[PDB]
Amino acid sequence: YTVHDTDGKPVLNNAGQYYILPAKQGKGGGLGLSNDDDGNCPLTVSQTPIDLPIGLPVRFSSRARISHITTALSLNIEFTIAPACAPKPARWRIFNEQSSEKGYTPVKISDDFSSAAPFQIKKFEEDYKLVYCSKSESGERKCVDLGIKIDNRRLVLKEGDPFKVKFKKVDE
Amino acid sequence: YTVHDTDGKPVLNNAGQYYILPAKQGKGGGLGLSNDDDGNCPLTVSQTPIDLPIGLPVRFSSRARISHITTALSLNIEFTIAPACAPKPARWRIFNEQSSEKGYTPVKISDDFSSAAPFQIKKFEEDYKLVYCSKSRKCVDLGIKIDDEKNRRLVLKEGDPFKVKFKKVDE
Lengths: 172, 171
Description:
The structure is a homodimer.
Chain A: E1 17-22, E2 28-34, E3 44-49, E4 58-61, E5 76-79, E6 90-94, E7 107-110, E8 119-124, E9 127-135, E10 141-149, E11 154-157, E12 165-171
Antiparallel strand pairs in A: 1-12, 2-3, 4-5, 5-6, 6-7, 8-9, 9-10, 10-11
């Protein structure tokens, strides 16, 4: 499946800017950055509060020799607008020393740069979900749904409970 | 010995692209870049903490312009894809400092010129290792040191070479 934005247009590969918005009416807005145990810089991918429903734009990047993204691609995801304190690129990652169990680890931004592209977009009813695919210390490949932890509500690995998302195009 | 990739085919000299992968799985992914005291840009050659059989693509280049990489060749190694902030070329070279507390001598990327090609690939068990040969020349195994921190940095580590294999990037 080609991933479509809220205007029905294919989502670009390695170009343009998109908000990741909740697909369902809930207690927060689009994904942004907050400071969750990060020190001097907000590095944690989090829902914005409902009074500021727009977070930060992202760019989706795949090795795939195509101009648009499908639900088949391995992706990296980076915020295209980020605080000046933050690493470049502001690339999404999880911090877990190849743990066999990966759930409720928050998605953070990091410098770490490779062609390993652990995120994928999957269909979820009328809209989409995000998943994170990797192997553990045990060798097993798992793709785990990304969901919301309520505790700015954090984007975390959450196998039973995907955060339903849609994609709003900012710019090309 | 000619160096062979994961398919069994000789590694190309001066052409083609490879991932440098751990021969052992479960201990992180292929070699790419991380920020180890590098400021705003990941400059330090490190295993990706994502356990996937993928790294950042590397090109092997030697002044001797034969078709294949052997264990006798003096080599430059550079990442062919790097972050926007990285030096171009993203050429691998040994950093001239050990961190005061963390210690070890990491491989970093730099656009610095060298008269000498410092790397070699040598056989190691059933697969291979990377060694760094520094002209004042003496060759030292490159191994992985995990910091606190959990960056899996490629560093000088004579006893303890990081066993690697080479996956061709067309696939």
